[PDB]
Amino acid sequence: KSFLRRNALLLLTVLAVILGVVLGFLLRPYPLSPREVKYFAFPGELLMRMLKMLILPLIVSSLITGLASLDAKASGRLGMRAVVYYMSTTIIAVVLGIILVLIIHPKEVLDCFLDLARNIFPSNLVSAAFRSYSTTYGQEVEGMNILGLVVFSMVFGFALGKMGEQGQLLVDFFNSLNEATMKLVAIIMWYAPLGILFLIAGKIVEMYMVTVIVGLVIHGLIVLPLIYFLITRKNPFVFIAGILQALITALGTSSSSATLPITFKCLEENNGVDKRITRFVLPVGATINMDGTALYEAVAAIFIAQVNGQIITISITATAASIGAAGIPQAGLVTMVIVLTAVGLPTDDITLIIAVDWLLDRFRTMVNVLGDALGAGIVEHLSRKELEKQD
Amino acid sequence: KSFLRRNALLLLTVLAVILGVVLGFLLRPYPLSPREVKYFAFPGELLMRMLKMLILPLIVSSLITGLASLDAKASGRLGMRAVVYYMSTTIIAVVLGIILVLIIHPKEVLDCFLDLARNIFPSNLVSAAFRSYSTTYGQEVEGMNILGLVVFSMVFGFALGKMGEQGQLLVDFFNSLNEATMKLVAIIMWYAPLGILFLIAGKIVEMYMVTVIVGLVIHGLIVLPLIYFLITRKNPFVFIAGILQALITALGTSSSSATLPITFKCLEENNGVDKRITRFVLPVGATINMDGTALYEAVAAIFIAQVNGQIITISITATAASIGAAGIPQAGLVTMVIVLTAVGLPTDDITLIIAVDWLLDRFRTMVNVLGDALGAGIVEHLSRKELEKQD
Amino acid sequence: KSFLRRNALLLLTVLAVILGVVLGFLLRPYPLSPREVKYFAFPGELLMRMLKMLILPLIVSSLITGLASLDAKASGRLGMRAVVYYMSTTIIAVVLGIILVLIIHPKEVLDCFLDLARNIFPSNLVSAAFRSYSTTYGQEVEGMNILGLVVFSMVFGFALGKMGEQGQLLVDFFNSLNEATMKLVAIIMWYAPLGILFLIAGKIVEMYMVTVIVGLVIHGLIVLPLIYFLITRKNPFVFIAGILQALITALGTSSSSATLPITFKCLEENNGVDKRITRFVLPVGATINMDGTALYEAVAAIFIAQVNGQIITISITATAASIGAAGIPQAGLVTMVIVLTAVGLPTDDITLIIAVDWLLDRFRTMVNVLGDALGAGIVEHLSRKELEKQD
Numbered sequence A, B, C: 001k002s003f004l005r006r007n008a009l010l011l012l013t014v015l016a017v018i019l020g021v022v023l024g025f026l027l028r029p030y031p032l033s034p035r036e037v038k039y040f041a042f043p044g045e046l047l048m049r050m051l052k053m054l055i056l057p058l059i060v061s062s063l064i065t066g067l068a069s070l071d072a073k074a075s076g077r078l079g080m081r082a083v084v085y086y087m088s089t090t091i092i093a094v095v096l097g098i099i100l101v102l103i104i105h106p107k108e109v110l111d112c113f114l115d116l117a118r119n120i121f122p123s124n125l126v127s128a129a130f131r132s133y134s135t136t137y138g139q140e141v142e143g144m145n146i147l148g149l150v151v152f153s154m155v156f157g158f159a160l161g162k163m164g165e166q167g168q169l170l171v172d173f174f175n176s177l178n179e180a181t182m183k184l185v186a187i188i189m190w191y192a193p194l195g196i197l198f199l200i201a202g203k204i205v206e207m208y209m210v211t212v213i214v215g216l217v218i219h220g221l222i223v224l225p226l227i228y229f230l231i232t233r234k235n236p237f238v239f240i241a242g243i244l245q246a247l248i249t250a251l252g253t254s255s256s257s258a259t260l261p262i263t264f265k266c267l268e269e270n271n272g273v274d275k276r277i278t279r280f281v282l283p284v285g286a287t288i289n290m291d292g293t294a295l296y297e298a299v300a301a302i303f304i305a306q307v308n309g310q311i312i313t314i315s316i317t318a319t320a321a322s323i324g325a326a327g328i329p330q331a332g333l334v335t336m337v338i339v340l341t342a343v344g345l346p347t348d349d350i351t352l353i354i355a356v357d358w359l360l361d362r363f364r365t366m367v368n369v370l371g372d373a374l375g376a377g378i379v380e381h382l383s384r385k386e387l388e389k390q391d
């Protein structure tokens, strides 16, 4: 009984998945038009709006205070520690992806690299808050430029750190805002159980597929906790238990950015991790992490090759696509088109994967959110001395 | 002579209506193309831009400071007092509308209720400042989402109230901004006489109509002041005299939001009403008040029924349309289309009402602005003890 | 050797022009599609994004602190001193333009004056940060409304000045932001040499022309320094030497707004000019200065007259076009269409000038930036007593 009283929301979100699968399977014979399905998935559609609302005033305030709270020289070194994790776990994921297709075996290319660079330095910051760039033959398309806001908030936040006296007012300003936008997220958390059940129920009512989920669950729950135990020497599945209210949301939302306001709450509260490092690792992680998506795209790129050397060129192109899709609508659907041009394979295969990606996209995010959460834990232990200096 | 010296602007705006009708009737034979009429109505078209400019930094700052200045528990109870007024005066207005058609007698329906809920929780706050949602088969259409900004500013303002120490800096920030955006409104007030005369003169040069204005003037100047005298026990037409510089602007602007920066000045200055309650009742009132529009739409919905039980379904649909039209262009023209689908009557009748609505829209706002102004007065008297606690 | 150590960036930007002309002429035979030329001009295309990013949080913060730091009554008088320079140098430029065509001799008109007034008072401030108005038969077109933001920031900044106590927090806020957005500009300055060489090299690879450059260099380097020596009595080409890192950028960027963040740094650092006057003269100057463009448009308007009284009507129309083009894409290309309607000459001549304007546009900005820089110097000397009062 004492477990039900403490972990009330945790069990309710678990109940939401159970009831969500039940309600979906109960209302599986569909005599209703897809127009009506959209009307049904509405109590979960509202949760998405509330979460996406909070993305921007969280991402901007997180990194502005994050880089200013952290010492000017220490910021640079702590970042190397984050990139050490971000590049290592990405190499293992793309390596695991080639292993899975070996034993089992079941817009332009150049423009994606240019558009990514075009977004790193935004032309306008007001536009950046709801518009991203991707050249077409308007090139500024709908959907937040989270890459441009993260990059600007890094240097802007750092500029305030090196400003000290004059810079103190604005850091106090974004810390107040980060705390306010986190007080709003404690409320949106209570709508989540009602949301999740109406969100996953709507999405169900519409061997290669298994290949991804097989390697996905082993990289997530075996490779990553082994990286935590190797560096921190602490129990990883106790840490994973803390971020459960964040992991369940990830399995429904499918967006690391939309789940970031909850990922922030779950890590700060349940796991007890320092805000300065969560504001540093988490926003960047939920935007440039390749672990989850690289493993999903690796099997997705060698699948059409079976129907039909230079493996290094396939991985780099699959990386420039996902970082290029920060908050872009139908992200995995449009990015997989460019990777097929680099390998020279038809786009006829995509029309089949879309019908099953809806569930696969939920799983790739669950690994990405675990990668960012564990990434923070690994960073804190490897930088415990740098935080002692500030106190 | 002493009246001319004190009430200089008040008489100038009165003179603007007189000269506006004269200039319009003097330049009534129109050999000029509607392109040229737009060029003539320009010195009043600028006033609209200046007022609409000020809407957003007023609405956001008003409710942020409003909910933070007011005590956390008292905010909830004071709101019940506002909703008591907002739901009672709306019931009387829709009741008076059915009475007027009894003696005299002269996008989907479901989507309007969904889009309203879709706007209450905005997906992005930067977009919300100039874009509203209304699904079409881009669904985000031009025009400020005043509903989404009011709702966000309520919870955000409240979050700062419950933040105290850290939250003090941001409340001091939006109070400075509210005072600054009010110092700009004292200036825009002097352009108003020159504006009003060129605005109403341009709009003229282009039994059922009388039915609305008959009940409109009796609900406004008879029903509402009786609600003031019943609760406050104070003289209502002395209060109405204070908000005259606001009532005249309403008769030209036709938008409660565009007139709100002046409605704020008229109530704070001439009537001497506490800023904490004006920042609480007025922004919400100038967005969710149904009094004026419900009385206009009630006669507009039973008029086509004469050409041709379930009266409850007509009223709720007419409510979801006007709240859905916060700052939407050609508001009364597009909303009246949905109400005809619920009753099952043709849209052929709208092509006739548009030619006379231009003057009828000015009258419905005049009652709505009086409803929000008197609403504040009724709220202050019913919550004088809650404000004493803060001092 | 001591000159290379101090003026490192100054010589690098000089080297960028030299190497930029060399690389362009080396890669002059073009077997590559214009699609590939765009890909080549990319390391300079990024510099433009970084600069344009900084325009808005510089322009808004500059004038907000500028009008608040300066005394309420002194602001009005110091402005007359700026307009004295802005109207005199414009009269001389349009006079010099008629002289050049005398010896050598080698949307509606009304709507441009209406749209300019429509932009001075913006309808929305969020939209103003990335959208300008210009009626077409959406009228709000892409590109920052720098006119509307300058005008709003003037009155808003002044409102804070007249607010004192409450207003102190927000002025401290925009001064922190101006200092932060200037700390970002010191970094973007180091990318400029790499940018300029890839920017001008790409633009090359694609008697009347000489007529503009002849009068342009004599008004810039002869007329303007004579205005400095007549008022300040100080050496002008020592001042011009200080703003060299700004003049070189102007010869590549072609936009006074995009070069303003560097024009600000060059004047504050190298020349040692007071921030209060740079925040006052420079943003306004880089938006309403007609010197450079009026001289270019004067020769451009009387050139087609040769192919084919009321000279006063041609000058005023050429003024309403350039102020109307603050941050509008293909500015000189669309504005020259309206001036031809007022004189009654065909638009067949524009198709030829576009092929050479790319270099002529770079020269007109170089004079405009020199006009704003020298304008500040002339203003400081004519208002040295007004700044002593504040200290």
Ligand SMILES: COc1ccc([C@@H]2C(C#N)=C(N)OC3=C2C(=O)C[C@@H](c2cccc4ccccc24)C3)cc1
Residues within 6 Å of the ligand: A072, A075, A076, A077, A079, A080, A082, A083, A154, A155, A158, A279, A280, A281, A282, A284, A285, A288
């Ligand atoms: C492209 O995707 C990214 C962006 C950032 C990062 C690292 C990170 C994380 N996680 C965070 N929070 O800050 C910094 C990082 C650095 O490498 C460098 C570090 C830094 C230190 C000192 C001065 C800087 C100035 C500008 C930008 C970063 C700076 C900040 C990694 C990948």
Ligand SMILES: COc1ccc([C@@H]2C(C#N)=C(N)OC3=C2C(=O)C[C@@H](c2cccc4ccccc24)C3)cc1
Residues within 6 Å of the ligand: B072, B075, B076, B077, B079, B080, B082, B083, B154, B155, B158, B279, B280, B281, B282, B284, B285, B288
């Ligand atoms: C949909 O249209 C509306 C929105 C608001 C209101 C009321 C109102 C007015 N007028 C204002 N200024 O504040 C609050 C109101 C409440 O009912 C509730 C009250 C409140 C109290 C305590 C905590 C809150 C937390 C979130 C939102 C409102 C809260 C605030 C009425 C209708």
Ligand SMILES: COc1ccc([C@@H]2C(C#N)=C(N)OC3=C2C(=O)C[C@@H](c2cccc4ccccc24)C3)cc1
Residues within 6 Å of the ligand: C072, C075, C076, C077, C079, C080, C082, C083, C154, C155, C158, C279, C280, C281, C282, C284, C285, C288
């Ligand atoms: C249309 O293009 C422009 C806008 C501005 C200016 C002048 C200027 C410059 N440069 C700056 N920085 O401030 C002021 C100017 C005034 O003439 C007037 C001055 C001023 C003084 C006192 C109160 C004011 C209130 C509102 C606006 C300006 C005010 C400010 C000139 C042309």
Ligand SMILES: [Ba+2]
Residues within 6 Å of the ligand: A085, A086, A087, A089, A090, A288, A289, A290, A291, A371
């Ligand atoms: Ba990674």
Ligand SMILES: [Ba+2]
Residues within 6 Å of the ligand: A164
């Ligand atoms: Ba410090």
Ligand SMILES: [Ba+2]
Residues within 6 Å of the ligand: B085, B086, B087, B089, B090, B288, B289, B290, B291, B371
């Ligand atoms: Ba009401």
Ligand SMILES: [Ba+2]
Residues within 6 Å of the ligand: B164
């Ligand atoms: Ba308090």
Ligand SMILES: [Ba+2]
Residues within 6 Å of the ligand: C085, C086, C087, C089, C090, C288, C289, C290, C291, C371
């Ligand atoms: Ba000038």
Ligand SMILES: [Ba+2]
Residues within 6 Å of the ligand: C164
């Ligand atoms: Ba002072």
Ligand SMILES: [Rb+]
Residues within 6 Å of the ligand: A254, A255, A331, A361, A365
């Ligand atoms: Rb996703």
Ligand SMILES: [Rb+]
Residues within 6 Å of the ligand: B254, B255, B331, B361, B365
């Ligand atoms: Rb209206």
Ligand SMILES: [Rb+]
Residues within 6 Å of the ligand: C254, C255, C331, C361, C365
């Ligand atoms: Rb230009």
